[PDB]
Amino acid sequence: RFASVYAWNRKRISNCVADYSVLYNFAPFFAFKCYGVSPTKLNDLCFTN
């Protein structure tokens, strides 16, 4: 279930280990653009929120 572009669904993620490999491992994910960060360094960064 995904909402429309307006009234978009928003979910906060915290208190859990973040493994980003499975994210970009998906084949249909053709469009994956990062701003202020590189895709290769997502698995090594620390996030506050």
């Binding site: 906060r12 915290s14 929120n49």
Partner: protein
């Protein structure tokens, strides 16, 4: 991003000095435009 501060001190606002301190951890994106205070009574309404 939330922001909440609290500080308890003995004494209207006096001419003393006191600094508020962070107390909670509530990361949730909300366009907060409302504020409601909650009182207490014993009339049992």
């Amino acid at each position: 991003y939330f922001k909440i501060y609290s500080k308890h001190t003995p004494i209207d606002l006096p001419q003393g000095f006191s600094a508020l301190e962070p107390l909670v951890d509530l990361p949730i994106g909300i366009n907060i435009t409302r504020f409601q205070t909650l009182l207490a009574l014993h009339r049992s309404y």
